[PDB]
């Protein structure tokens, strides 16, 4: 492309252009909150990890 040229990805490419998946951040902190909530239900250190 020459100079002074831009472009855009939109549609559902606007949605994925924002973010395709911030989901694995939520699987990460989901694993966190599952880990600690089971650390209350177990009420035990690392016994939940099973």
């Amino acid at each position: 492309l020459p100079t002074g040229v831009g472009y855009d990805w939109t549609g559902m490419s606007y949605q994925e252009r924002l973010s395709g998946n911030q989901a694995p951040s939520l699987y990460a902190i989901s694993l966190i909150v599952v880990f600690l909530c089971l650390a209350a239900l177990y009420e035990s250190w690392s016994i939940p990890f099973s």
Partner: protein, 50 residues
């Protein structure tokens, strides 16, 4: 009744961590501006004509 949750001390740890990541989510979520907008609303309708 507090001692019941002394008996699950890891539960109180979990509460502290919920504070740590609710608060971490907050400080990575909260917008920044030094002056939480104080002045009354003042619409300034203006014009110009030579």
């Amino acid at each position: 009744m507090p001692n019941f949750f002394i008996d699950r001390p890891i539960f109180a740890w979990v509460i502290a961590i919920i504070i740590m990541l609710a608060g971490g989510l907050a400080i990575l979520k909260l917008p920044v501006a030094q002056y939480p907008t104080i002045a009354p609303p003042a619409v300034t309708i203006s014009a110009s004509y030579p």
